[PDB]
């Protein structure tokens, strides 16, 4: 007897300042009888290309969770990162060794998180062999190097600083430089980020992130 959208109300989602494009669309929710409680905890996943306006990030997605509401504006915070399935299926190819590492670490903000990084072996410029398999010693060494690097950047930074590092892909270049002597590699990427635990909420630390 009631069309539900007569009672719905629209809200505009705003992204953190760390991303270029704050406008990330809008959502809807039932009008308060409150709308805030249903709104809070809502998670939206969006490609980095839209937020940065560059097609160089076509294969990466960011999950942002709603943490505050003010006057129809939903102030969100970084919640996770992932790759698109097509890109991962593209990288994973025959005749090469896959080296994947994961590390659990807490930022300077007590944000406990888990970083998954992936890399693959590549053949040299003059290489003639079909395959570029790496001996298990080299794989273990590279995995250790990646783990140390990721722990170092995460521990000595805040979550906002961590995202600021994630966007330009500096960590991937650092891994490439560190692992250059061990074995040649390609497609070095921070495959995924999970946010396991959260500290006590601080609306000031969110407003500062949103300006």
């Amino acid at each position: 007897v009631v069309d539900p959208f007569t009672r719905k109300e629209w809200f505009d989602i705003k992204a953190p300042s760390t991303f270029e494009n704050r406008n990330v669309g809008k959502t809807l929710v039932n009008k308060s009888t409150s709308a805030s409680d249903a709104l809070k905890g809502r998670v939206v996943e969006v490609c980095l290309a839209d937020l940065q306006g560059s097609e160089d990030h076509s294969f990466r997605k960011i999950k942002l969770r709603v943490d505050e509401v003010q006057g129809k504006n939903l102030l969100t915070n970084f919640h996770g990162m992932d790759f698109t399935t097509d890109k991962l299926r593209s990288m994973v190819r025959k005749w090469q060794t896959l080296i994947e590492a994961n590390v659990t670490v807490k930022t300077s903000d007590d944000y406990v998180l888990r970083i998954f990084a992936i890399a693959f072996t590549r053949k040299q410029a003059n290489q003639v062999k079909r395959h570029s398999y790496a001996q298990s010693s080299h794989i273990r060494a590279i995995r250790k190097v990646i783990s140390e690097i990721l722990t170092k950047e995460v521990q000595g930074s805040t979550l906002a600083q961590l995202t600021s590092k994630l966007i330009p892909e500096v960590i991937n270049k650092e891994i490439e430089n560190a692992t250059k002597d061990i074995f040649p590699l390609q497609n070095i990427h921070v495959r995924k980020v999970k946010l396991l635990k959260q500290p006590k909420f601080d609306v000031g630390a969110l407003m500062a992130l949103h300006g």
């Binding site: 290489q127 003639v128 062999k129």
Partner: peptide
């Protein structure tokens, strides 16, 4: 020279074959 690159490719095809 870049002709060396041509040599590697020709070998690569022969190996793949």
């Amino acid at each position: 020279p870049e002709e060396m690159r041509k040599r590697t490719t020709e070998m690569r095809l022969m190996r793949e074959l």
